[PDB]
Paper text:
The nucleoprotein NP of Lassa virus, and other members of the arenavirus family, suppresses host innate immune signaling pathways, and may be linked to the profound immune disregulation noted in Lassa Fever infection.
As a result, NPΔ340E391A is able to bind dsRNA, but cannot catalyze the exonuclease reaction to digest it. As a result of the required mutation of E391 to alanine to prevent dsRNA digestion, only one of the two cations is present in the active site in the crystal structure (site B). This site B cation is modeled as a magnesium ion, because of the presence of 5 mM MgCl2 in the crystallization buffer, and is coordinated by D389 and by one of the phosphate oxygens of the 3′ terminal nucleotide of the digested RNA strand (G8). The ribose 2′ oxygens of C1 and C4 of the complementary, non-substrate strand (in the sequence 5′C1UCC4CUCC3′) are bound by the side chains of Q425 and D465, respectively. In addition, the nucleotide base of C1 forms a π-π interaction with Y429.
Numbering used by the authors: 360 to 546, 549 to 569
Write the structure that this text describes.
RNA sequence: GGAGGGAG
RNA sequence: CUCCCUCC
């Protein structure tokens, strides 16, 4: 009937903010979290340099906790004030019949089809782990200030020894670094959404 | 159950 | 840690 949790004022603000997108530009999307219970969400257009990055709190904290140690290293403490509903809102604003590019389209497909957008055409570059990540450290370097949200230490099976430490999976960096791979190098970036749209400024209060 | 991949 | 895909 309506769009949950967002008032009309900020919902129009959003819709205007997302008209800054070129419907026909190359458009990247990655997520952190399960498609059922996503936590981080990024969309990227290298052509303009503009991106949509925001956050959601997990409903399953158990599944979230494993995912953080072996994938994203996100501290649930840092999702503390995030716009409820934002995901459904942003997905709904995406242009009818859009073309998204991603890696491992199966997660992205599951999410969009759960938002009712079957109309969105998905292009999976279908790379390999070692190909796609080839621009990782440079992307993380030039672009570090854009995500401070992966605090955690992320690990991997060492063939000899069990845990080997790595660089975690940020929807945003992945978006950027996959483009770099598919375009053979690095492409200035601007957020489509205002900070107080993706995060509530929490105020001091008396507890009741 | 194995072989390989991919995702969080 | 957990999910997905392909193959026998
Ligand atoms: Mg992905
Ligand atoms: Zn991130």
């Amino acid at each position: 009937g309506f769009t949950a949790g967002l008032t009309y004022s900020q919902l129009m603000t959003l819709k205007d903010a997302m008209l800054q997108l070129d419907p026909n530009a190359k458009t990247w999307m990655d997520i952190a979290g399960r498609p059922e219970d996503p936590v981080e969400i990024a969309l990227y257009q290298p052509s303009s340099g503009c991106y949509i990055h925001f956050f959601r709190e997990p409903t399953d904290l158990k599944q979230f906790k494993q995912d953080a140690k072996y994938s994203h290293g996100i501290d649930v403490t840092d999702l503390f004030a995030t716009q409820p509903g934002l995901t459904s809102a942003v997905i709904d604003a995406l242009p009818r019949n859009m073309v998204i590019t991603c890696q491992g389209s199966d997660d992205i497909r599951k999410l969009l089809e759960s938002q009712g957008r079957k109309d969105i055409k998905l292009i999976d570059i279908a790379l390999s782990k070692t190909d796609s990540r080839k621009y990782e450290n440079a992307v993380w370097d030039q672009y570090k200030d854009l995500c401070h949200m992966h605090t955690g230490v992320v690990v991997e099976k060492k063939k000899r020894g069990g845990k080997e430490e790595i660089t975690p999976h940020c929807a945003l960096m992945d978006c950027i670094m996959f483009d770099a791979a598919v375009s053979g190098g690095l492409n200035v970036l601007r957020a489509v959404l205002p900070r107080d749209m993706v995060f509530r400024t929490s105020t001091p209060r008396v507890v009741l």
